[PDB]
Design a protein around this nucleic acid. Sequence first.
RNA 1: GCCGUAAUGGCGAGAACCGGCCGAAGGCGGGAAUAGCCGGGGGUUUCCCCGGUCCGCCCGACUCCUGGGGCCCGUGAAAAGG
Length: 98
Amino acid sequence: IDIGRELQVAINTGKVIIGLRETKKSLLTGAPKLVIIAANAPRWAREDIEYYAKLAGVPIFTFPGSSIELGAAAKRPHKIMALAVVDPGQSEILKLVE
RNA sequence: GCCGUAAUGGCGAGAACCGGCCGAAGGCGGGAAUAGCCGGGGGUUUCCCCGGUCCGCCCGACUCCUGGGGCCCGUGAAAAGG
Ligand SMILES: [Mg+2]
């Protein structure tokens, strides 16, 4: 699976929440299906997402790139530490879960 | 894309924008006009009385405060006290 191509499909067809602060809110208040975290996320951010996603029962996929590379894989000109997939519109981004 | 600077620029690692919190030198009132000063008088040995002590602008530090940026094979004390 190409992570980037499927992420751009989930963004444009479904509902994708982009950014650490909004991802945390979705985990705490919403019901996201998958959370993706960049490999070079800071220790404080990784532990926060790991803890909240655990209590929320949401799987975490660690993107194999930096937050700069995750942003490029989402066709964004900015970093993305973490993003939450709430709706996989026409992609199979949920294939990353297993 | 959007927001900038004297200059460097800033943002999903959270921008613009809106509301708030902490927060200088110093300003202003009180001190305080009763003082001091200026002018006009009367005493005596330094005392008493009278009038004014205003309006509107500008420059402005080497003094005081604040923040930004840069440099170092150089990194710019310690303790009492609080
Ligand atoms: Mg200049």
